[PDB]
């Protein structure tokens, strides 16, 4: 909601309280989503100031406050800043921003990140260019310097992030994406490669000194319809754990498919049908193994722009004999959302 | 404060900065409240959108930022989300919400949770239905479907919360409360029982596979006067620690009495006189032991709706020979509050 | 930004998203500022209510959300509440506030805390009266009860803070400062002494049972010019670590010099030239050692009151043979800031 707006600056303080619960049999250990209360809230801000007619400066911070922790020792578990960046946009020259933001490959994955509850599977955090990452300088151009309506690109420079953890770490890399959108249609291609840190390499699984990820996407967005599909691959980027050996590393290779079909009725009900499969190749020891494999059926009802509720159902296709220990059980998410 | 309100949605961003200090002799280890700086702040939001004439959706998140920590390693100590839930209210059919919210038994305890500084003693956090708990679905009806002015009830379904800690954990349970308020008067009865988790049972103190808590309350609220009283009991719900043995568990049984008498002068001064006693019964090893026993005298002055200050004094009746090690010293809280 | 303002109360919700990066050779271990992404954001509130013509109540909370952490285990690293206090101001009698706030000696140091990125060096956190500290009651008078235009003073009572850490701890102490400002000029003197906790004394470095700190400052602030200079000393207050021995404690004595010269062009560019030197005396084992020694050159450009960017360059004068292990490398900070 725009709480402020005077002297060319407008602030939008936003957020949401989400009452959420996951239903999966057992202790949700062998299920897709786990089981139980998963309530949380979000608070963030989106500022934007008009330095003059062509120039705009802006910033954005979004945080994630878990709502399923005690007020005890575990009170902080799960909390975190998701985004944090400032930037500038100049006339038709493009925009530039730096901070914790979305990797460029997500310019593609974003297409199928539309399930009611469950977040796009391959769009992981602090995992190179696919999801939110720290210290990324990102340039974006729209309409090819205003010469070509609908043609946009982006390039992105990722700073090395040497964390205490091989999974949350990354070396320096570059990434770019080109997309084109003409009347309800959209096509995209994204790609980025990056150095792997000593620790990432000291890991038992995955072998390389460079990590890559690219995805392409196609979408039809219009007439209350939303059909979207993505296909991409990766090398030594995808984080995987062998639950048996308690071994971890990155998938040498993966092939990721995502499809999403949705319809927005005029009365508020938005049904969703999706399919996601990601399979690792050449995992050291196991060979080929599926990481994510399921169908999804669900529906969201929008009371209005501030209230909605939804049920998301995961028909997990993974099988009980999955070598990595990847869970085979179903998960049903029911949630109620208020937001501003 | 209502920062937003357009298109049927209104947001109230609220909060307060509380400069607080506790005065107790010694290292506050043997005192009621402890000793020293206890400054903190709160930030939260309360949204509410009118989906149509009969339907209202809403949400609420409130956080607690401690203000007495260094900017060092201990910076986060004490911080936590207190509430987080979204919900809906339909005409005269009632309301329903889910998330981290107040247990139904607090519908009663709330009566005597009026001391200037010190929080109602028996109204503990992540302790079944008495205080704030995670994952509670709560239905509430007002005025008996609008047929009976002043008659309200609530039922509540608590989801199992298996935490790393026996004290912050809970099994599934149900709770309900009926209250009636006719012209300044209010009466209430609340009750709820819940399963105890393996860990809660693996504990040295307290013996059962089910935890219960009920309280009743009576209040006269009007003419600048506020007299309130509560009485309740509990089984294997009340958390207790034996400071000698460093033993912990839950009180097999307790009997809790709370009384509160206050007056709001027209110039701002609200004096408070209270009495609280809670005694455990059949504690494994000790027999009967008082957990909370003191008188309270204090006063709050309201400069206006945004500023106030208060002194709260605890005349601890607990004695030095209390078997559990429960402190016997007095505590004096002085605080200055700004709030919006 | 003032989001609220009705019925004599006005709330200012403020904050900023700072995209920041530090460039230093090596692993920034031997540099002045370290190296890499250092993006972060801030959110705070400043309330103020007019209880009547002479009386004003107010409060303030400011938090620091790091933006360079993963969404993993390290998500919280670096976060903290910087300020948290409520208070009152009465006519010309002065003001009083309590909570986590700025030590009185900072009334002086504040003069040279003007570098684009790098925070005043000697103005440390949870270090007695120089920077932000917990539990400080602070009285401030302006214009000598309104009798003497430009004459202000402050006294401050610091509560003992026994933390788990000798560095973040402190005993009870008092501090005061007198400053005078006549037409663009300002002069100040500040001083405060405090008890040292058992733990602070159980430390290997620094010897005393009382810690002191005073600084004086002189400034010319006007005509787009800002020249400021500070000089102060300290006893057993300054925290120091010997990187070789992994020894820590406080400097027996220090002599701190800070100078700052800046100019604000009319088009937005504010260049900065500074000099800082702090040297420890009589360090147990080493003798005299410099702690901070460098020049600074940098410039900030203000697009407007909401957007700016800056480069700050540290020409570290410390030498590689510094006995404590204090880094000798340069650091270059580049940052983009959006703020409201
Ligand atoms: C506003 C500061 C931008 C700093 C960008 C640093 C990029 C560093 O490495 C990129 C490697 O690709
Ligand atoms: C909006 C989702 C509500 C989910 C409620 C789950 C309740 C589970 O167990 C209750 C036991 O009593
Ligand atoms: C509003 C409460 C103020 C409490 C101030 C306590 C000061 C304690 O010690 C000061 C030592 O100097």
């Amino acid at each position: 909601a725009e709480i402020y707006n005077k002297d060319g600056n407008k602030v939008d303080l936003y957020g949401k309280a989400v009452g959420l619960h996951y239903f999966s049999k057992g202790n949700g250990e062998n299920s897709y989503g786990g089981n139980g209360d998963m309530t949380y809230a979000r608070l963030g801000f989106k500022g934007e100031t008009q330095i003059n007619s062509d120039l705009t400066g802006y910033g954005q911070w979004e945080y994630n406050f878990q709502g399923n922790n005690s007020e005890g020792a575990d009170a902080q578990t799960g909390n975190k800043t998701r985004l944090a960046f400032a930037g500038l946009k100049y006339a038709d020259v493009g925009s530039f921003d730096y901070g914790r933001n979305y990797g460029v490959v997500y310019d593609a994955l974003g297409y199928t990140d539309m399930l009611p509850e469950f977040d796009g599977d391959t769009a992981y955090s602090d995992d190179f260019f696919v999801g939110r990452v720290g210290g990324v300088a990102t340039y974006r151009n729209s309409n090819f310097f205003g010469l070509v309506d609908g043609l946009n690109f982006a390039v992105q420079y990722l700073g090395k992030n040497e964390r205490d953890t091989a999974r949350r770490s990354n070396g320096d890399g570059v990434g770019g994406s080109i997309s084109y959108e003409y009347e309800g249609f959209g096509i995209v291609g994204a790609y980025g490669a990056a150095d792997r840190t000593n620790l990432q390499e000291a890991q038992p699984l995955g072998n390389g000194k460079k990590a890559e990820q690219w995805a392409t996407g196609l979408k039809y967005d219009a007439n209350n319809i939303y059909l979207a599909a993505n296909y991409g691959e990766t090398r030594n980027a995808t984080p995987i754990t062998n639950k048996f050996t308690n071994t971890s590393g990155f998938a040498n290779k993966t092939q990721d498919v995502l499809l999403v079909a949705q319809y927005q009725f005029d009365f508020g009900l938005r049904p969703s049908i999706a399919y996601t499969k990601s399979k690792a190749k050449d995992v050291e020891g196991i060979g080929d193994v599926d990481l994510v494999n399921y169908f999804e059926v669900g529906a969201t009802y929008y009371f209005n722009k501030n209230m909605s509720t939804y049920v998301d159902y995961i028909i997990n296709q993974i099988d009980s004999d999955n070598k990595l220990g990847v869970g085979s059980d179903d998960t049903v998410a029911v949630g109620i959302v208020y937001q501003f």
Side-chain angles (χ1 to χ4, degrees), chain A:
Chain A
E2 170 168 283
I3 63 177
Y4 192 73
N5 183 9
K6 292 290 170 187
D7 299 330
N9 181 64
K10 65 162 149 297
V11 191
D12 173 345
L13 186 63
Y14 69 82
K16 59 182 191 197
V18 169
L20 177 69
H21 197 84
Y22 283 6
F23 303 83
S24 316
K25 51 184 153 291
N27 194 349
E29 187 180 301
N30 196 252
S31 75
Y32 166 82
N35 163 243
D37 183 35
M38 299 280 321
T39 297
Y40 69 93
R42 298 273 168 74
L43 200 67
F45 76 78
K46 293 195 222 298
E48 175 182 299
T49 174
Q50 271 187 70
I51 292 151
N52 60 49
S53 278
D54 323 311
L55 199 57
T56 277
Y58 57 83
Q60 163 136 237
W61 165 76
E62 182 179 277
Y63 197 93
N64 174 74
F65 297 104
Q66 280 309 137
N68 48 330
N69 297 320
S70 76
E71 288 184 20
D74 58 285
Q76 304 293 337
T77 289
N79 306 351
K80 63 228 169 187
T81 269
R82 291 160 44 94
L83 308 178
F85 63 82
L88 293 144
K89 320 169 207 169
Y90 182 18
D92 293 305
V93 186
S95 60
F96 170 86
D97 52 66
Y98 173 83
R100 184 187 177 68
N101 202 347
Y102 279 107
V104 272
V105 169
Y106 183 86
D107 269 20
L109 300 182
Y111 273 21
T112 62
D113 194 339
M114 304 282 286
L115 303 196
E117 159 51 23
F118 304 97
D119 283 299
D121 279 271
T122 59
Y124 303 84
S125 297
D126 318 297
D127 175 52
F128 299 91
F129 306 86
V130 306
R132 300 174 306 263
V133 253
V136 290
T138 293
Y139 169 74
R140 294 194 170 273
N141 178 270
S142 292
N143 299 328
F144 202 72
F145 301 83
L147 298 168
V148 174
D149 278 337
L151 179 61
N152 311 299
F153 70 100
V155 50
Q156 184 184 82
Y157 301 99
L158 169 75
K160 150 180 279 196
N161 283 321
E162 289 196 43
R163 308 197 188 293
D164 306 306
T165 256
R167 154 95 180 78
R168 300 287 171 172
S169 297
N170 71 268
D172 303 295
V174 173
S177 74
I178 314 177
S179 96
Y180 180 65
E181 297 180 32
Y182 177 68
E183 182 179 43
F185 294 97
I187 179 166
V188 206
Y191 170 86
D195 281 323
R196 295 176 87 222
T197 48
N198 280 324
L199 185 55
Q200 275 181 321
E201 295 192 74
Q203 292 317 286
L205 294 158
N207 190 2
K209 299 179 70 74
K210 199 87 181 171
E212 304 178 39
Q213 304 153 314
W214 65 273
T216 62
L218 236 138
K219 72 149 189 184
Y220 173 64
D221 184 4
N223 292 141
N224 302 318
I225 320 164
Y226 186 84
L227 303 178
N230 286 134
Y231 176 67
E233 284 172 20
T234 62
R235 300 307 138 90
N236 305 300
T238 289
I240 62 174
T241 311
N242 179 344
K243 287 185 179 171
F244 300 141
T245 58
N246 276 139
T247 285
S248 314
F250 298 73
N252 275 328
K253 199 293 208 310
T254 77
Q255 291 187 193
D256 318 322
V257 207
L258 296 307
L259 309 156
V260 164
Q262 298 178 352
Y263 188 87
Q264 179 64 39
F265 281 89
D266 272 349
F267 51 87
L269 178 86
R270 160 177 283 253
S272 163
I273 290 306
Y275 179 62
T276 294
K277 175 181 185 182
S278 174
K279 48 172 302 74
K281 284 170 170 53
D282 313 324
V283 178
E284 16 290 288
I286 298 74
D288 300 32
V289 216
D290 283 4
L291 300 186
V292 181
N293 194 344
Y294 70 70
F295 284 86
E296 170 277 351
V297 183
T300 287
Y301 183 97
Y302 296 94
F303 291 84
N304 54 16
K305 60 179 168 182
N306 302 101
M307 207 70 205
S308 69
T309 44
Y310 61 86
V311 191
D312 206 6
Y313 180 24
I314 291 285
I315 294 178
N316 205 345
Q317 300 312 332
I318 286 285
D319 87 282
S320 37
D321 290 355
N322 171 305
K323 309 295 168 176
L324 288 187
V326 173
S328 57
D329 289 334
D330 295 21
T331 303
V332 169
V334 186
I336 171 165
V337 172
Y338 165 81
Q339 60 166 71
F340 60 110

